[PDB]
């Protein structure tokens with residue numbers, strides 16, 4: 001399988017699924033390096049973030065566990081089609097890039113924080129990560145180019 005992917009078994013159904021230990025994506029379907037990639041993201045900050053402040057909230061006080069629960073619920077709405085990634089990022093990302101529907105532009109290895117860089121370069125064009133942890137908080141990442 002492509003870099004990072006492995007097999008596992010569902011606890012509740014008994015059916016095989018696929019999981020990526022670099023991007024934290026998981027799916028039923030069997031999964032299908034460049035100098036630069038282009039990505040968007042949605043950030044949820046918490047009280048242990050490097051800078052616990054954002055354009056949404058002068059003082060960010062939620063716990064790391066509470067932030068992960070918010071990220072999990074946004075992923076559910078994106079996967080069911082109830083909401084679009086771009087819409088949720090504009091309304092709820094704790095990054096100034098919410099301004100641009102989460103778009104960060106193109107970048108190379110050596111510029112972003114290392115777990116974000118590794119996840120971005122393990123995604124295929126069109127693919128979305130699961131929760132990704134950095135010193136800034138917890139992210140959902142979409143590779144666009």
Ligand SMILES: Cc1cc(C(=O)NN)no1
Nearest residue numbers: 027028029030031032127
């Ligand atoms: C939700 C999902 C992922 C995929 C896939 O990776 N196909 N190669 N298809 O549907």
Ligand SMILES: [Cl-]
Nearest residue numbers: 123124125126
């Ligand atoms: Cl690709």
